[PDB]
Design a protein around this ligand. Structure first.
Ligand code: ATP
Ligand code: CL
Ligand code: CL
Ligand code: MG
Ligand code: MG
Length: 536
């Protein structure tokens, strides 16, 4: 339905990338080099060089294939905190030809159930903080056969990973996995609807990562700290595959409370040269006392996930002397556009295409648009599907086919490309409002509302109108002190306020006051959920 690939028949990140570095150490061609440095922020630290990482990951593969009896192709849910065993287990899965399916420890039992059922997981790997949740729902998951516990303690019904690991052989015969063979399944965030199962192959993660490696400016002798939930695709790409493609060290902090002061102390206390985090990390750091906590070793700061505001960029540069280089992507496509270390930074832009990709702005018929014209961001997938693109939605070929327009995979995001090929994000396409022939981006309206002291949080969406077709509607969470005000009067005041700072065709003709907004587990506002209910 979407091009053929040009790839080697076989590919495996463990054998083709990681084991190279272990072999160099074994052969005396490189000194023993740190690969994984883990700290808990309470005095415990652990470090593996590449040889040790290879050996201990071979033990993990033996545990999974031997003791757990998991066979090539079997699906393994992984729900762990930021502990070194996540890295070991994922590598174990890659070696043993098992499909790893990471998720967040922040899941409720209902979330865990949905994913285990939908995914037909045959195994779950978890820590002691989620086993009680798992054990309330496990009987309802008929494919689930193995429960593997990473803990200092044992629990009846759960296999003891750490004990089995120490018992296992340090030799494992890596499976000769195919480049297009399924390696992972990631659920999408659920921002627009129920989470989708996105299948990735050995090459779409590992070979793509190998091709991208170094875009951050990270080099072989350096340490990168990627700040991420272990359930996100960011973790596999930037915490695991990209440093290890280069022979560099990945730094992991348990960071049990995402505390920005702990982040700051960590930067200032360890020789971290490169860091990756969502824009909120930088925003939080800027609210800390950066006079008192210097980090002269830090060189490269990158971000992904939401728009990097120009003010954030400017403030960071002023306070630290450093740039923040933005990137863009989605579960389905991995790293799609970025500002590489040699590129000029353009505030408000997310960079240029990843090297495997032909990224364009396209019209409603799939035609490439000139620079300066807003349209849909797409990646060319015909006649050749590029390395890095996912394999499709599991059990949902129709949904896969629905996002292909002509020769392009649609990201679902609007954008504009400038004269140098840099992309500017212009919003989720489905969120743009069409009222009286005007297109209205909710972000500008939400920003105008957030200026007003009454507004704590807001979401702007379309609402159906006996006709203007649809109108702009704002859902507003009020500051406590405004709950007492007359709402009709306050509504007019907020309307007038927006009319004062934006094109007055953009103002919310409807305002509904609400006590909360629906969000994903990561805190992303579910505008679709609101739109769906608004439209019945
Ligand atoms: N640099 C960025 N600037 C603006 N938005 C970004 C950037 N990076 C990513 N995004 C947004 O995040 C999206 C990808 O997020 P992800 O794949 O986690 O799932 P999601 O789309 O939020 O959830 P779902 O697919 O279930 O609706 C992109 O399609 C885009 O809307
Ligand atoms: Cl913390
Ligand atoms: Cl920002
Ligand atoms: Mg999405
Ligand atoms: Mg406000």
């Amino acid at each position: 339905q979407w091009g053929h690939q040009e790839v080697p028949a076989k590919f495996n990140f463990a054998s083709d990338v990681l084991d190279h570095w272990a072999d160099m150490e074994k052969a005396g061609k490189r000194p023993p080099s740190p690969a994984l440095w883990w700290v808990n922020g309470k005095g415990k630290e652990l470090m593996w060089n590449f040889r040790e990482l290879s050996e201990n990951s071979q033990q993990a593969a033996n545990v999974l294939s031997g003791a757990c009896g998991l066979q090539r192709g079997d699906r393994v849910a992984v729900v762990l905190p930021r502990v070194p065993e996540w890295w070991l287990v994922i590598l174990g899965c890659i070696r043993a030809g098992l499909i790893f399916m990471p998720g967040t420890i922040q899941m409720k039992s209902t979330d865990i159930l949905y994913r285990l059922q939908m995914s037909k997981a045959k195994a779950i790997v978890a820590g002691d903080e989620v086993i009680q949740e798992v054990d309330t729902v496990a009987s309802e998951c008929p494919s689930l056969r193995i429960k593997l516990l990473v803990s200092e303690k044992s629990c009846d019904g759960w296999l003891n990973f750490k004990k089995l690991l120490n018992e296992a052989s340090t030799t494992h015969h890596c499976v000769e996995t195919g480049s297009q063979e399924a390696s992972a399944i990631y659920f999408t965030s659920g921002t627009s609807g129920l989470p989708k199962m996105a299948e990735h192959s050995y090459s779409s993660l590992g070979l793509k990562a190998k091709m991208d490696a170094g875009w951050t400016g990270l080099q072989a002798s350096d340490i990168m700290w990627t700040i991420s939930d272990t359930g996100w695709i960011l973790n596999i790409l930037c915490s695991l595959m990209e440093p290890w493609a280069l022979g560099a060290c990945t730094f992991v902090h348990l960071l049990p409370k995402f505390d920005p002061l702990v982040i700051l102390k960590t930067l200032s206390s360890y020789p971290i040269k490169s860091m990756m985090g969502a824009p909120i990390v930088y925003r939080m750091l800027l609210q800390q006392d950066l006079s008192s906590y210097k980090f002269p070793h830090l060189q490269n700061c990158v971000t992904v996930g939401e728009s990097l505001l120009p003010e954030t960029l400017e403030n960071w540069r002023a306070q630290t002397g450093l740039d923040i280089r933005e990137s863009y992507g989605q579960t389905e496509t991995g790293l799609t556009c970025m500002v590489s270390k040699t590129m000029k930074i353009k505030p408000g832009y997310m960079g240029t295409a990843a090297s495997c990709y032909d990224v364009q702005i396209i019209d409603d018929k799939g035609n490439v648009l000139p620079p300066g014209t807003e349209g849909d961001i797409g990646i060319r997938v015909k006649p050749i599907r590029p390395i890095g693109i996912f394999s499709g939605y599991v059990d949902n070929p129709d949904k896969t086919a629905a996002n292909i327009r002509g020769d392009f995979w649609l990201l679902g995001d609007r954008g504009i490309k400038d004269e140098d090929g840099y992309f500017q994000f212009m919003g989720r396409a489905d969120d743009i409002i069409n009222s009286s022939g005007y297109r209205i981006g909710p972000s500008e309206v939400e920003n105008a509302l957030m200026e007003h002291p009454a507004v704590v949080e807001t979401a702007v969406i379309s609402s159906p109108d006996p006709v203007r077709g649809e109108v702009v509607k704002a859902f507003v969470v009020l500051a406590s002190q405004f709950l007492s005000h007359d709402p009709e009067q306050l509504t007019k005041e907020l309307q007038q306020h927006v009319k004062s700072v934006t094109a007055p065709y953009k103002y919310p003709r409807k305002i509904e006051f609400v006590l909360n907004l629906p969000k994903t587990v990561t805190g992303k506002i579910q505008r679709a959920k609101l739109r769906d209910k608004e439209w019945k």
